Amino acid sequence: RGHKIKGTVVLMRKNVLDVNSVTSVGGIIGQGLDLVGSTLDTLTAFLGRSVSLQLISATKADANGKGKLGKATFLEGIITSLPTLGAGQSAFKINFEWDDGSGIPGAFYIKNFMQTEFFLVSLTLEDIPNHGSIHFVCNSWIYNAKLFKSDRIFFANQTYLPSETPAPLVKYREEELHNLRGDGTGERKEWERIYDYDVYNDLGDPDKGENHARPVLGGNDTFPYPRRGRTGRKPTRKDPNSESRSNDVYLPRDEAFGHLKSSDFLTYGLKSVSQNVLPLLQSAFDLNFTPREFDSFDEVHGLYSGGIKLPTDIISKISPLPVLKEIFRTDGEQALKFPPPKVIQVSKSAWMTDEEFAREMLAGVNPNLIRCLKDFPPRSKLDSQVYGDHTSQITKEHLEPNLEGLTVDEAIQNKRLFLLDHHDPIMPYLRRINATSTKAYATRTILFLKNDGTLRPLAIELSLPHPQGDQSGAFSQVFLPADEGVESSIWLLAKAYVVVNDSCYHQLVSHWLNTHAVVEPFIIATNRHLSVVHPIYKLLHPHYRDTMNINGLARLSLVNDGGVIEQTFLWGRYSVEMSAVVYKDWVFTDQALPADLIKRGMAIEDPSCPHGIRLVIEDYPYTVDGLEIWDAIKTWVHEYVFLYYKSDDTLREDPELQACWKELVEVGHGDKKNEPWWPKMQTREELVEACAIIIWTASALHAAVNFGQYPYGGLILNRPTLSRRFMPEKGSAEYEELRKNPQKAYLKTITPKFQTLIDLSVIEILSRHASDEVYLGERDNPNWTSDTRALEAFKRFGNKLAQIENKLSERNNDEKLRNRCGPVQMPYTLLLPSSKEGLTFRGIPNSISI
Ligand SMILES: [Fe+2]
């Protein structure tokens, strides 16, 4: 007897997912008639000889060893309703012929014969013998069949290690991987799923003119860099070593995530700030429709209340903009409002306190930098400029003021001296930097641990490059706390010059290089060498969502010449290249949270403690919370790796893992290919350690470093991005204005009103959760694996993350932990694992989605 295997295809239309057609606006989704398909009878168009599916057997091979073929069969009727049919999805039924001889299906080929591509989500088979239902999760765009030599193949639910591949599917598995790799030539087309590497020869535009040229980041000892996804474009005409610029930056097709709500297309929203808002805003400044400058602090505060009064003309073209509707509020006509940033929702003035300044190094936008001070004076790593032979000029006499009354030696002994050091990367470029419109210092802040457990700043060292040459060291001045008179204002100016350094390092290193840039060679290596079926592919896959897409954007628009990062932040046109010089010190294994903590002296290893380490400041929120998160990931990654791999030998026998990690190392981070610290793939503990660092980086680290951007920085007074004026000197007229009107002096020193609007527009988006976000650990999409052991393991991650959330909230209810809240009363929630959509100050995503 023949039997018919009963089949269920779930796909989504492009019109349901594509920005241009989803361009109405969207505000509530997970709904509609939870899009039935059915309704609006255009589903009938999938139903002739339009799309064919062809089952592939996993138990029966042909003469040359490959799985037997089913007979190409077309979609047969429209399925209106299914218990799991989600919003915007459409369902089609299709019955395949099989027998007691075509075996157990473990794969299928698919052919779109229609004009338009569609996102196939899943296929489900309801079977024949003593075999349960087979689920296939596809999640991949299917373009017209004419574009492919070998038809689109998908595999079932079952997780297989390469040894565990069913013999009839071994060639198919390997052959997909081959198709994914490519040959490293050609221009990469929209419809392609081809994964490879290039250097960042990408960011500059020397055909527009030589001042638009940027250096090649990567491939070299001066400017080493992580690789980025390969695009195929022609060389620029002027420099054959750079790639020509395009509006249209390729990433492998399935890496670009479509959306159901239009408000959720944040990259388009970001491309819209730079290409539509910026020039229309520019206009209004350049002609004379808004004042060029802020005059008082209340004028900055007026951006959240009354907004920026703008002509109806230009407001008419920035307010029907698709995504940007959710980030701009319009009262009617002359108004462009920003949401109250969470740093001012209680106190407007509290940002200026010394407690908040010191505290935001433990718990703000960049809570990752501070060092425990172990000797004195603090020394430089810099070379032949003479202060890594000399030092800091902050002195023992500067440091003995008010609080305890111990010596600086004794302050170091008892672990109560700490350091924000922003001297070494920005010094060597500082002379160049200061010869643009930027006026900046290379800074140092020495912080004291007080009795209540809070941090208090005790000295700020402001350094300028060279009276008489680089071989002459630094010229440095030193500024002490004062809360009275003109001295108070000089001090608040001295904090502005530190924060400005910090904004910059944060954006290029703590944010861009440490998450975004660095995760990319990992995504490429995984797709080139780990099959969709592979266990580690499935572990690591959620942690990659939309990442190549936002990096493809940033290359076109954030990290490019004259881009937002360049226009906005302290290092200017030197930003991305200085970030590469810092990457010379990037060590993968030091990106593990305990390693980072111990290295910066903020933790020490103690096997009598909660996580086997002990903090030297208890109330270092970022880090007590981070540590809870780190251990949850590393426990999850340990149960998951150790589920699949019985021995270290099974790992060394795993040729997919081995080739993947080889390519990561020798190619993806190939400028670090001889570094002694890379985990070999010799040991299961090494795979756990690297899988935990990939996930930490892409989820929790990216979140701690990213979602606190608009809440802390949406107030430009709190996190300025550029200083454009040196400190007022005693005799000068700038000094009498500092006396007379210090708010005006503050403002002429920081980011101008125009770039502030750009900076606020950018980070407001960068701090938003898209509705359709998939957060840490509670979350994936459907039936990812039929291996219930892994599924159980994942549930234990979710439960523990949930338990951690209650425990973190508990800590923000604690008035004893002062550093969690500040004078600004902003609970530290940036590591709370779950979130709603929007500009929340919380929610850890699986990946770098923005
Ligand atoms: Fe980001």
Side-chain angles (χ1 to χ4, degrees):
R1 292 151 256 250
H3 182 53
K4 299 204 105 114
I5 280 192
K6 192 142 347 142
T8 291
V9 170
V10 162
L11 65 96
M12 295 168 98
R13 312 203 53 194
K14 159 173 186 206
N15 326 296
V16 105
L17 261 353
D18 179 62
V19 63
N20 305 303
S21 35
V22 102
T23 287
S24 270
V25 190
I28 295 164
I29 226 36
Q31 263 113 201
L33 271 144
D34 273 57
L35 245 19
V36 234
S38 224
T39 332
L40 195 36
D41 214 5
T42 64
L43 278 337
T44 227
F46 288 78
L47 232 57
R49 312 274 214 174
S50 287
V51 184
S52 74
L53 275 83
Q54 178 161 56
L55 296 207
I56 289 179
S57 167
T59 46
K60 243 82 183 107
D62 60 45
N64 272 252
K66 297 161 92 168
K68 245 138 183 227
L69 286 198
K71 264 93 52 51
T73 340
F74 298 90
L75 317 178
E76 178 204 355
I78 298 152
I79 302 178
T80 152
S81 190
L82 280 200
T84 51
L85 193 90
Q89 308 205 305
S90 293
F92 303 94
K93 37 178 134 228
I94 164 170
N95 297 306
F96 319 92
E97 274 133 297
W98 215 236
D99 32 40
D100 255 357
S102 356
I104 296 158
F108 77 95
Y109 279 124
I110 207 213
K111 280 180 112 78
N112 192 352
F113 288 94
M114 311 158 88
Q115 231 43 288
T116 323
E117 75 260 29
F118 65 74
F119 189 76
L120 161 92
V121 193
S122 81
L123 160 75
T124 306
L125 320 180
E126 295 172 332
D127 238 81
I128 319 204
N130 219 279
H131 206 300
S133 303
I134 306 173
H135 304 263
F136 303 76
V137 182
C138 321
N139 295 347
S140 148
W141 285 90
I142 323 297
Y143 281 65
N144 183 289
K146 258 192 132 205
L147 318 177
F148 311 90
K149 213 177 171 125
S150 93
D151 300 354
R152 294 291 277 94
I153 175 162
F154 293 92
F155 299 73
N157 249 196
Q158 297 117 310
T159 298
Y160 297 118
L161 260 181
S163 90
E164 315 180 306
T165 333
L169 302 178
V170 172
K171 235 224 140 155
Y172 285 142
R173 174 179 182 163
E174 301 169 352
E175 116 134 292
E176 235 296 276
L177 253 36
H178 176 86
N179 280 332
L180 253 17
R181 286 159 211 143
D183 62 12
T185 60
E187 205 178 9
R188 287 285 80 79
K189 300 326 258 70
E190 189 221 310
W191 53 261
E192 281 172 336
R193 271 162 52 245
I194 297 162
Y195 287 85
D196 210 344
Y197 313 88
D198 228 328
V199 280
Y200 279 89
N201 61 339
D202 199 358
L203 308 181
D205 205 338
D207 282 353
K208 267 21 231 317
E210 252 337 283
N211 76 290
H212 290 293
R214 280 324 177 252
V216 170
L217 320 186
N220 79 106
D221 317 298
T222 288
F223 290 137
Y225 228 56
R227 288 308 96 105
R228 43 92 173 185
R230 193 201 167 254
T231 45
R233 290 174 234 121
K234 55 176 176 197
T236 78
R237 298 189 114 214
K238 232 64 121 174
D239 184 33
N241 269 329
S242 303
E243 189 182 340
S244 63
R245 293 274 310 175
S246 175
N247 253 134
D248 280 287
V249 181
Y250 164 96
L251 48 285
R253 188 51 198 89
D254 294 340
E255 297 291 324
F257 280 73
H259 302 276
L260 228 45
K261 279 170 64 156
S262 108
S263 47
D264 276 355
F265 282 93
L266 304 185
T267 59
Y268 182 108
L270 251 14
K271 161 203 260 101
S272 223
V273 198
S274 276
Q275 286 184 197
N276 299 272
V277 188
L278 199 154
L280 259 225
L281 238 37
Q282 187 130 46
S283 231
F285 278 80
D286 290 349
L287 317 177
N288 286 306
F289 293 109
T290 18
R292 298 286 250 67
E293 300 277 328
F294 293 124
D295 279 358
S296 73
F297 274 7
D298 327 58
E299 289 192 14
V300 180
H301 289 287
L303 293 176
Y304 327 109
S305 110
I308 186 176
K309 184 211 121 120
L310 239 25
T312 94
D313 218 60
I314 94 112
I315 215 88
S316 303
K317 315 186 197 99
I318 61 188
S319 109
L321 294 191
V323 175
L324 261 24
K325 142 101 245 183
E326 136 98 15
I327 62 105
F328 290 127
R329 309 119 142 268
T330 299
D331 109 84
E333 268 149 356
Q334 293 221 277
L336 183 88
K337 341 202 138 152
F338 283 97
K342 213 177 252 282
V343 81
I344 51 88
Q345 308 176 13
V346 173
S347 210
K348 289 280 191 84
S349 72
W351 71 264
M352 308 193 254
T353 59
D354 275 356
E355 174 183 349
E356 188 65 4
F357 176 64
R359 183 201 87 87
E360 278 185 28
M361 304 177 195
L362 292 183
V365 83
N366 197 24
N368 200 156
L369 232 49
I370 194 166
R371 231 126 263 172
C372 182
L373 188 64
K374 289 312 207 279
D375 61 353
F376 203 73
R379 330 144 50 210
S380 188
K381 266 336 270 148
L382 281 181
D383 196 33
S384 211
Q385 33 258 131
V386 301
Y387 41 117
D389 201 278
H390 281 134
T391 17
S392 150
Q393 300 240 46
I394 291 185
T395 215
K396 299 183 140 204
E397 289 77 32
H398 284 140
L399 288 196
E400 317 174 350
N402 186 42
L403 238 281
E404 190 145 5
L406 335 107
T407 146
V408 30
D409 278 1
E410 262 175 347
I412 281 151
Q413 245 181 120
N414 325 142
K415 307 223 194 211
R416 287 175 88 171
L417 265 178
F418 294 91
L419 175 88
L420 236 215
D421 203 283
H422 276 288
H423 194 104
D424 311 339
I426 202 204
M427 251 282 176
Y429 274 88
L430 200 47
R431 88 225 150 120
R432 265 165 291 192
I433 286 193
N434 286 350
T436 67
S437 67
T438 283
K439 307 292 148 272
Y441 297 97
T443 63
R444 246 180 218 122
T445 299
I446 278 178
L447 297 112
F448 188 57
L449 169 51
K450 290 195 310 196
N451 289 149
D452 45 32
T454 43
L455 234 33
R456 207 205 122 174
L458 246 58
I460 282 171
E461 175 179 19
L462 289 199
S463 305
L464 285 182
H466 45 238
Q468 35 235 55
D470 281 87
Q471 271 192 115
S472 256
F475 166 63
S476 306
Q477 331 167 56
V478 167
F479 295 89
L480 304 179
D483 41 49
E484 175 152 4
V486 201
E487 294 89 12
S488 68
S489 324
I490 258 173
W491 174 246
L492 178 93
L493 291 192
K495 302 187 275 176
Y497 305 113
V498 176
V499 176
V500 119
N501 277 207
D502 211 269
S503 285
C504 208
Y505 192 92
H506 167 259
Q507 188 67 237
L508 272 332
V509 180
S510 319
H511 180 245
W512 173 256
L513 172 78
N514 284 181
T515 63
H516 273 272
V518 125
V519 161
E520 240 199 290
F522 282 104
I523 297 150
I524 307 161
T526 287
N527 292 259
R528 278 171 71 82
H529 289 310
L530 261 34
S531 173
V532 280
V533 160
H534 196 112
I536 307 291
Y537 181 101
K538 305 186 127 133
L539 176 59
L540 255 22
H541 198 240
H543 292 280
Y544 294 170
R545 172 194 252 237
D546 233 11
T547 297
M548 286 194 77
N549 192 22
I550 177 65
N551 289 356
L553 176 96
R555 296 208 321 275
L556 159 69
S557 244
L558 281 17
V559 126
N560 74 115
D561 97 276
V564 175
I565 293 198
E566 296 203 347
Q567 290 150 35
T568 308
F569 292 92
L570 189 82
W571 304 346
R573 57 145 309 151
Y574 302 105
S575 288
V576 219
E577 77 189 75
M578 290 173 61
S579 72
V581 174
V582 167
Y583 166 80
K584 299 179 90 209
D585 296 344
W586 188 76
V587 359
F588 181 61
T589 33
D590 281 0
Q591 308 286 313
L593 193 68
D596 168 64
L597 253 31
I598 300 199
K599 200 226 214 130
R600 292 156 36 215
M602 295 295 307
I604 164 72
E605 233 141 75
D606 185 343
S608 207
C609 276
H611 306 292
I613 50 191
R614 56 158 343 116
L615 322 176
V616 312
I617 288 165
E618 274 162 6
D619 208 7
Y620 180 174
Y622 164 65
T623 228
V624 246
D625 293 10
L627 266 195
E628 303 301 324
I629 301 286
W630 165 259
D631 272 3
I633 289 169
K634 158 152 208 235
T635 319
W636 146 239
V637 160
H638 195 276
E639 308 188 349
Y640 184 97
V641 165
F642 280 68
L643 235 190
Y644 284 95
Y645 295 92
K646 303 157 142 137
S647 47
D648 289 333
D649 284 327
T650 53
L651 196 103
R652 307 185 276 244
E653 296 140 11
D654 189 343
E656 265 181 33
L657 185 78
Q658 276 326 315
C660 187
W661 191 253
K662 196 179 170 78
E663 207 201 51
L664 185 270
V665 155
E666 307 187 323
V667 190
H669 280 263
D671 300 333
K672 288 175 191 314
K673 63 165 136 118
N674 298 317
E675 297 293 347
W677 45 256
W678 285 115
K680 283 253 172 126
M681 273 311 123
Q682 288 322 274
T683 252
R684 283 176 296 164
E685 288 88 350
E686 282 165 326
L687 167 69
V688 162
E689 175 80 22
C691 278
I693 303 177
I694 301 161
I695 287 179
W696 169 258
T697 297
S699 43
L701 176 81
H702 182 258
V705 118
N706 181 89
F707 294 99
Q709 275 180 99
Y710 190 95
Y712 284 107
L715 212 236
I716 209 51
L717 279 7
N718 196 47
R719 301 287 295 182
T721 68
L722 67 81
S723 51
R724 38 157 182 166
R725 204 177 242 218
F726 291 134
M727 186 74 78
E729 248 263 307
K730 291 226 127 111
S732 72
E734 319 88 78
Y735 198 94
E736 228 216 23
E737 137 175 291
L738 193 42
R739 297 191 174 268
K740 246 156 205 197
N741 182 359
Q743 283 163 223
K744 198 37 161 133
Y746 196 72
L747 303 155
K748 341 234 271 205
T749 303
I750 60 154
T751 322
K753 165 181 168 186
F754 172 69
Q755 296 101 97
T756 285
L757 306 182
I758 304 298
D759 155 64
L760 267 52
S761 298
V762 154
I763 70 185
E764 160 170 11
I765 292 161
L766 250 51
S767 288
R768 271 244 295 125
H769 293 312
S771 265
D772 62 331
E773 186 66 270
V774 207
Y775 302 89
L776 204 58
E778 175 141 53
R779 292 166 176 97
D780 239 65
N781 8 266
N783 296 90
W784 66 286
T785 187
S786 33
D787 182 332
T788 74
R789 320 163 308 160
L791 244 34
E792 238 174 316
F794 189 50
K795 193 88 247 97
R796 288 183 310 236
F797 188 36
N799 297 160
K800 164 82 125 336
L801 249 13
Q803 270 230 317
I804 283 168
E805 192 166 295
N806 303 187
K807 179 186 261 242
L808 253 38
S809 275
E810 228 158 354
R811 289 177 208 192
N812 291 159
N813 269 29
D814 206 355
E815 34 282 294
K816 286 127 203 269
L817 309 182
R818 308 185 139 297
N819 307 324
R820 296 207 81 91
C821 284
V824 110
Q825 295 287 278
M826 261 187 106
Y828 190 74
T829 58
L830 237 26
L831 249 8
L832 260 57
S834 103
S835 209
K836 41 263 105 58
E837 38 151 342
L839 208 132
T840 59
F841 171 57
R842 59 175 293 177
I844 303 193
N846 279 318
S847 84
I848 287 158
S849 40
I850 201 38

